[PDB]
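Exercise (ungraded).
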Amino acid sequence: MKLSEVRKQLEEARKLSPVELEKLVREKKRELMELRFQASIGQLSQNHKIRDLKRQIARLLT
RNA sequence: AGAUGGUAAGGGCCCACGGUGGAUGCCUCGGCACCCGAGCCGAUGAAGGACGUGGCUACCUGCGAUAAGCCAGGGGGAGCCGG
Ligand SMILES: [Mg+2]
Ligand SMILES: [Mg+2]
Ligand SMILES: [Mg+2]
Ligand SMILES: [Mg+2]
Ligand SMILES: [Mg+2]
Ligand SMILES: [Mg+2]
Ligand SMILES: [Mg+2]
Ligand SMILES: [Mg+2]
Ligand SMILES: [Mg+2]
């Protein structure tokens, strides 16, 4: 289900849009990094948070 | 004075039961032949690779830093996150 919702809202990134396709992505990635840091230290990650993010970004990157 | 009897360190044949070995039978996801179909790919970067890519990933597979994946259309109708 996660699809429909986000992607629609994602061309909804059209106030500023490619500029925001971008801005958003950047923010999305910092999250991934923050997230896989938590990931590696162990005592701060529960998995799919990762996958789900990476794929936000593949979609975002569209 | 005399006579021919038991011994088995070990060995031989026979039976029995094991070990080892992987023949025989059955099996088959593979192979072989024929026939039909189909028959080009590439600078819009092929064929084929290297290195990567999974929360934990050695390999195989898939994929390409959007990395076992992204979008859309079609199919399908309870399961799914490969081996
Ligand atoms: Mg005598
Ligand atoms: Mg004897
Ligand atoms: Mg003896
Ligand atoms: Mg015995
Ligand atoms: Mg890795
Ligand atoms: Mg990882
Ligand atoms: Mg790993
Ligand atoms: Mg591989
Ligand atoms: Mg890219």
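Further reading is listed at the end of the chapter. For now, observe: Residues 3, 7, 25, 36, 39-40, 45-51, 54-55, 57-62 of chain A lie near RNA strand B (CB under 10 Å from a C1'). The CA atoms of residues 39 and 47 of chain A lie 8 Å apart.
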